[PDB]
Write a protein that binds this ligand. Structure first.
Ligand SMILES: O=C(O)[C@H]1CCCN1C(=O)Nc1ccccc1-c1ccccc1
Length: 133
């Protein structure tokens, strides 16, 4: 029952400072522009100890499956090859991605009927708000 309130199908309904976040991460111009248009569907499911998060959009379709606290390989939508660890901290799913001596943290939080996602790279924060599909 660890992630019950996250399970479901969610659709992006607002974005703030995302282009700047992607710049900070190192995404190039053309990818930033196309990726910034996307309205991804985030699909979260749990089977035993395995959590699966899928993101489907015109830009890219991605899927990760993981056990909390257990590092894995991820190729991100923008084609970074990262080492990821996802934990639960006070009811927030905290996803840390490490690559090339860099790190970014993506926090997924349930707030009212929304799922609020905060993406942080150094001093740059972006907020991505999702609602139930
Ligand atoms: O898209 C989102 O809302 C954010 C928050 C949940 C995971 N995610 C990303 O991984 N986004 C990205 C991060 C870096 C570069 C590109 C993306 C991206 C952009 C459009 C579609 C899918 C991922």
């Amino acid at each position: 029952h660890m992630c019950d309130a996250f399970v479901g199908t969610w659709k992006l309904v607002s974005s703030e400072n995302f282009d700047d976040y992607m710049k900070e991460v190192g995404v190039g111009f053309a990818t930033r522009k196309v990726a910034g248009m996307a309205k991804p569907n985030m699909i979260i499911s749990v089977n035993g100890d395995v959590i699966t998060i899928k993101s489907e959009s015109t830009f890219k379709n991605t899927e990760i499956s993981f056990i909390l606290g257990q590092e894995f390989d991820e190729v991100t939508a923008d084609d970074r090859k990262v080492k990821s660890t996802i934990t639960l901290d006070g009811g927030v799913l905290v996803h840390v991605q490490k690559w090339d001596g860099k790190s970014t943290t993506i926090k997924r939080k349930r707030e009212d009927d929304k799922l609020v996602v905060e993406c942080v790279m150094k001093g740059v924060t972006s907020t991505r708000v999702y609602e139930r599909a």
